[PDB]
Amino acid sequence: EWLVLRDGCMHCDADGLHSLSYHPALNAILAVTSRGTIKVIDGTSGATLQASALSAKPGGQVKCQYISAVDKVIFVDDYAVGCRKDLNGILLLDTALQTPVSKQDDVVQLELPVTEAQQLLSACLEKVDISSTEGYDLFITQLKDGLKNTSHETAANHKVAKWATVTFHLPHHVLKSIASAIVNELKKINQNVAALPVASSVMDRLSYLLPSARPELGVGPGRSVDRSLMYSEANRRETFTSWPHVGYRWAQPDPMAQAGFYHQPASSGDDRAMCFTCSVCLVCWEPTDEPWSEHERHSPNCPFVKGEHTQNVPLSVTLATSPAQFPCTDGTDRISCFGSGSCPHFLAAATKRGKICIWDVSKLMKVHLKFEINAYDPAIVQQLILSGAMEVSLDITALSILQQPFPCLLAGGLLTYKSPATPLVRRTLPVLLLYSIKESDVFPKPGTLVQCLRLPKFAEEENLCIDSITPCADGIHLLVGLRTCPVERNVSGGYLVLYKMNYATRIVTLEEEPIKIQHIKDPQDTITSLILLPPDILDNISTLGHLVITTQGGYVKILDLSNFEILAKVEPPKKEGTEEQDTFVSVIYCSGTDRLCACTKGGELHFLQIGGISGVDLLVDQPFTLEILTSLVELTRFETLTPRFSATVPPCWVETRTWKLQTDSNSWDEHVFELVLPKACMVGHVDFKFVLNSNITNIPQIQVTLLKNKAPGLLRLCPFLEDHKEDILCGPV
Ligand SMILES: [Zn+2]
């Protein structure tokens, strides 16, 4: 029996909670309410960060999911799918599911942070005179009221202030004209202020939200490009599609495009890349030519070399302000299911009519594949023949992508067909369909069937439907959780089918024989949501980790993935003011709290903790032999952390990680940087490198102190350190 500790609970909303999602970089829980709003809560102190409505249609069923492999958040409604990511430590969730407009006069929602809005207001009131521009008074008044509402919350909590964004409701063409006027007015005065890149990013986001204001990229000889259209980084890196030197080490499109260069070739096959700010003539590129060093040498007066603020638009701002594309061009079909698998770089979306669109959300948001599933495939036909005019209706209920060898799409389909009774009866059968993803550069064509896996007899007998598909942490096994499909005896709670992936051929396939079948004989224990726990947390036939599932009645079950035996049981809490069951609906894992965070029926959040000195052979009492001292010395070495950790800084610092400080006196007295490791392991040390001012004539009395971040509740030192003096772990130095 495994021990689970309960140390309290928190109240998020009184409207209830349905699904949960956790962002590991910002330690933020994105709880999904039953009314469609997304409530972002911090995971370090219990103080809620923000609330969002995603600018979607009212009454829509918002479903939010997170991917840590690509570090992107997917929001799926009944209409469209939106992709978001972190931007300067906050998530721009106000316009996450914004439908792209078709005309210039449509009112668009423009969400902006606090420092950007303050710089825009300071420029418009001090350095920029744009009173002749259309819509100037409305934008000025909206900026003023947004800043005057934000400044009250600014002095209370810094993280809630940074998460708070001002949403302007203005027409698209008016905002575009205002931003163009700001860019021109700041360009004619030759002043390098912070409002210029803000306005450039704003106008690039507005141009990206409207496909009608996106002219075609005219990359060709004898034709100049539009520099104002080339202010975006994505267009500059798109211009290198015909680059003949992709195989070069440093002359690659992605590292060389971010320096502010675009391909303007005079012929077909050359390497002429011009800057979009200083217009430096560069030819005969070399594989050893570092882009930053070449831009510094050939143009030291370029503001990118000095780091000054230009009209550049970073790709992170465009990705954080990307629109929500519909799975079809008609935009009227409703999405039945979504998800991600062992290759989550591509995002799949299937409609109820049988059309699947796959987007490359890992790269820039574009159309990657679009096809329609035909239910009358020969493999489906012969599987239905082996099961027993001809009418077949196929509906997808789960989506996954499996990869070890190009990736393939796994769709969990349900086939309903009229069969004679041995009057016609509509029988349902769940199957798995494999479709090709990667296009051709006799291999199968994309959009065609690869493997038609047939589920065993109990799925057809009980009319079960494929509820969830999840690849295991090993990468060699796959789990399918079923449930009773409602119709428009002994009721079962579903089945857990563990399959083995097949990599015998060049295409990712599965095996017909299931490697494990587990039954849920209790109808009350119907599986609603699942999560997988990494085994290294327990390190503080090989075992395949632990699986945490939520039931219909709210009983959280933690089971070993090898045999699906009930190891840990968590009863649902009781509602306040009564004896009703506050049944758990969804569960996620919070790394910052190191706890299972589960949402209740009443909207509460509960954190469950997993896990709970003599008799050791020490390394001291032994005699001083050579091997023991050698093992002690080999123990005391240090290694570099890989991959990248997580960290956030105050916005006065702009960007193994480095930053540059800007002269801001709003919070000059204190600076708090937060660090979250990707995994709790053996802490060696932290290296803190600094470069000071060149005009320093006196030794500064400035101290840096490391502190253990406190877990949230479920000569005299500085007062902030006095507040956390007991839990200190380094310094003062
Ligand atoms: Zn330049």
Curated annotation (Swiss-Prot):
Q: What is the effect of changing residue 278 to S?
A: Impairs ubiquitination of CASP3, CASP7 and HTRA2 mutant 'A-306'. Abolishes interaction with DIABLO/SMAC and impairs ubiquitination of DIABLO/SMAC
Intervals holding WD repeats: 15-53, 54-83, 326-373, 522-571, 572-610
Q: Where are the BIR repeats?
A: 215-324
Cell compartments where the protein resides: Golgi apparatus, trans-Golgi network membrane; Endosome; Cytoplasm, Cytoskeleton, Spindle pole; Cytoplasm, Cytoskeleton, Microtubule organizing center, Centrosome
Q: Which domain of life is it from?
A: Eukaryota
Q: What is the effect of changing residue 289 to A?
A: Abolishes interaction with CASP3 and the caspase inhibition activity on CASP3. Impairs interaction with CASP7 and abolishes the caspase inhibition activity on CASP7. Abolishes interaction with CASP9
Q: In which tissues is it expressed?
A: Expressed in brain cancer cells.
Q: What residues does Zn(2+) bind to? A: 275, 278, 295, 302
Summarize the PTM comment.
Ubiquitinated; mediated by RNF41 E3 ligase and leads to proteasomal degradation, impairing inhibition of apoptosis. Deubiquitinated by USP8/UBPY. Autoubiquitinated; mediated by E1 ubiquitin activating enzyme UBA6.
Q: What does this protein do?
A: Anti-apoptotic protein known as inhibitor of apoptosis (IAP) which can regulate cell death by controlling caspases and by acting as an E3 ubiquitin-protein ligase. Unlike most IAPs, does not contain a RING domain and it is not a RING-type E3 ligase. Instead acts as a dual E2/E3 enzyme that combines ubiquitin conjugating (E2) and ubiquitin ligase (E3) activities in a single polypeptide. Ubiquitination is mediated by a non-canonical E1 ubiquitin activating enzyme UBA6.
Cite the record's note on assembly: Homodimer; antiparallel. Interacts with RNF41. Interacts with DIABLO/SMAC, likely with higher affinity to SMAC dimer than SMAC monomer; this interaction blocks the substrate-binding site and inhibits the caspase inhibition activity of BIRC6. Interacts with KIF23/MKLP1, USP8/UBPY, BIRC5/survivin, MAP2K1/MEK1, RAB8A/RAB8, RAB11A/RAB11, PLK1, EXOC3/SEC6 and EXOC4/SEC8.
- Family under the similarity heading: Belongs to the BIRC6 family.
Q: What is known of its domains?
A: The BIR domain is essential for its anti-apoptotic function and is important for binding to DIABLO/SMAC and caspases.
Q: What is this protein called?
A: Dual E2 ubiquitin-conjugating enzyme/E3 ubiquitin-protein ligase BIRC6
Boundaries of the shown chain within the full protein: 54 to 1186 of 4857
